[PDB]
Amino acid sequence: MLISVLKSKISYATVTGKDLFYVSITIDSEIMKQANIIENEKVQVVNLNNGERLETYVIKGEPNSKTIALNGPAARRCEIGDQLFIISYTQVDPTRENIKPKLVDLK
Amino acid sequence: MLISVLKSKISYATVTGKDLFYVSITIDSEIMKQANIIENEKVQVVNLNNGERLETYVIKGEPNSKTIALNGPAARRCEIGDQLFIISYTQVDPTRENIKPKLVDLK
């Protein structure tokens, strides 16, 4: 038996770029590290400016670049300067002790 | 094989507050206890006034406060006074015994 719970949250991630025709969210690899989020992990991305809510996967950005970029169709759901929260969830046995989320506040 | 089934439902939760620039959904910890919903658990939140449907995670509110508050980008999807249903699911092997959902009706 499993339930979904918060694993990681990055708060106040400022969008630095967007690329519709990408060759999904790019995040500074050091921020990913702080948040215990791995390459290709599924995340929920929510936008404080426009209210958009979406799910996509993570691409590594360059370490210490502060890159936060929405690529592909997700580019249509933001603009540069928007503030995001980026959330990862995990499925756990509810008979186990509670998971303590990793919280990263970029503000 | 595993399927998702209803584990908990809080019905007719009235929004008492909203804060866009939070430092998700805040629920009276006593109400959470009645519904067997734990802090940081993922929930579906559906709004009877405006029809909005979203997924977020639970933050504890003060016991017996009747606080129901949508924080962060979710704040853009409600107004004070709106009536919510708050739902949590669980993944189970359906060859096991049925999950009997915990139903909390606040109306």
Add this chain to the structure above:
Amino acid sequence: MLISVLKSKISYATVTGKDLFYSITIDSEIMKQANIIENEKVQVVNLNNGERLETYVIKGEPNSKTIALNGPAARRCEIGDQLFIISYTQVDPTRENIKPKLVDLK
């Protein structure tokens, strides 16, 4: 790996009712035909308006043909709309393939 795959689909379910101030209520015989159980999570997609939502199943009276959207979901349909109702299961992709139970109501 664990992946999600289709386990049941009810096609061309016609909305018979909606009640804002109550989920999806489905004739219990149709549920059995689809191998969908009470309180199971389902995807509901609407051919008339394109709406897509997830909710849980409530039993309707057997052989009533009841298909009703209740609660906030009521704002996402009207009586007479045609729905597809889909349930998924998580399984090992290398183990024997799941044959979905398909129920066509047209």
Add this chain to the structure above:
Amino acid sequence: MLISVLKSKISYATVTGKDLFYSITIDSEIMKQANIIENEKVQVVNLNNGERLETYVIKGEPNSKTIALNGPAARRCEIGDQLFIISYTQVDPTRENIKPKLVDLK
């Protein structure tokens, strides 16, 4: 604990058809390339209109290049739209990493 990670991505799939009164049909050789199986749940995202949906996969004829949105999903695209089609898997992250299968149809 389990987390969801990318397992398969088809990029720049051009919509060739849509049929409301039949959900995504994909050339079965493209599916094989992407390690996507019949009835697998997929995320479909549209570069032209920004729409994001979840549905399941139906086999199309091999080497046809068919990419067709069926059912209510038909209301969320037009012929010629470019799609990305994504599948995820739940894994124990302390095991070895899933190397995603990437198929670029551009």
